[PDB]
């Protein structure tokens, strides 16, 4: 479906920590491919997908470059944790969190649709970039002083536009080719219905899907044609730990009524949805 390249930066201050700690992950589509932790012995950006170890043989300074960027981003966020503390007039010594995600998205046909750059202080939206205007939306009211900082320097919006709509786009295309075998695969789900009798005596049917990629899936329990928003419990989609995802949808009924119900399972990987009865 869509494609994307996203980075997730998290910095936390603490009484436990002498300086605040900085962590970073990068994703192509739903697969994680790099990471960085300010608190390692020698903090360095490291591969976490097999296809990115390629990158060095036609870009030798790749890992060095990223590392420098992330060492400097480490100090950018430490400084920022202190600046924002002042904005929110808070005691020193606390536990505080500052986050940023950014990246770009393409169509299935590999054309840019959207870039983003968004930040949060203590789990609350702080500031974000409006991609169509390249101005700064101050969501937190005391983010307006950050907003005036960054708008007073056109090279900030200009550098995001160049990065979001060209640099990010070109690196994502390259990663996609580099990761052809894994990032191009679309994996249909296997699916199965299980039967469970509850201590009171009623019957739970559970429609289970696993081994699918991407993670978007529709699980529907039809009682003789009709959705059952009634007694239908879902679990949140979860990672198997090998690239794929699992989700199940349950439903409750009186013993004898099983044959009415059906589970429809649709997903990008299946020609036709799956119909499953108990």
């Amino acid at each position: 479906g869509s494609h994307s390249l996203r980075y997730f930066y998290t910095a936390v201050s603490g009484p436990e920590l002498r300086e605040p700690r900085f962590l970073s992950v990068g994703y192509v589509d739903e697969q994680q491919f790099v990471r960085f932790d300010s608190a390692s012995e020698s903090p360095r950006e490291e591969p976490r997908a097999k296809w990115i170890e390629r990158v060095g043989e036609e870009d030798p300074e790749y890992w060095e470059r990223q590392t420098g960027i992330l060492r400097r981003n480490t100090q950018v966020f430490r400084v920022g944790l202190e600046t924002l503390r002042g904005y929110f007039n808070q005691s020193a010594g606390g536990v505080h969190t500052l986050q940023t995600m950014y990246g770009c998205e393409l169509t299935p046909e590999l054309t840019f649709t959207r870039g983003f750059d968004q930040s949060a202080y203590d789990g609350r939206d702080y500031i974000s970039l409006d991609t169509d205007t390249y101005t700064w939306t101050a969501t937190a009211p005391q983010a307006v002083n950050t907003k005036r900082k960054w708008e007073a320097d056109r090279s900030i919006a200009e550098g995001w536009k160049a990065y979001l709509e060209e640099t990010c786009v070109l690196w994502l295309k390259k990663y996609l080719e580099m990761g052809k075998d894994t990032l191009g695969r679309t994996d249909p789900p296997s699916a199965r219905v299980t039967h469970h009798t509850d201590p009171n005596g009623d019957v739970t049917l559970r429609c289970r899907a696993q081994d699918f990629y991407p993670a978007d899936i529709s699980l529907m329990w039809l009682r003789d044609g009709e959705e059952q928003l009634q007694d239908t419990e879902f679990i949140e989609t979860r990672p198997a730990g090998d690239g794929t995802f699992q989700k199940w949808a349950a439903v409750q009924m009186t013993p004898g009524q099983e044959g009415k119900y059906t589970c429809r399972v649709q997903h990008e990987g299946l020609p036709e949805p799956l119909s499953l009865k108990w």
């Binding site: 960027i69 920022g80 600046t83 702080y126």
Partner: peptide, 8 residues
């Protein structure tokens, strides 16, 4: 590709 961010 990682990006160098700005002081808030």
């Amino acid at each position: 590709c990682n990006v160098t961010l700005n002081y808030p």
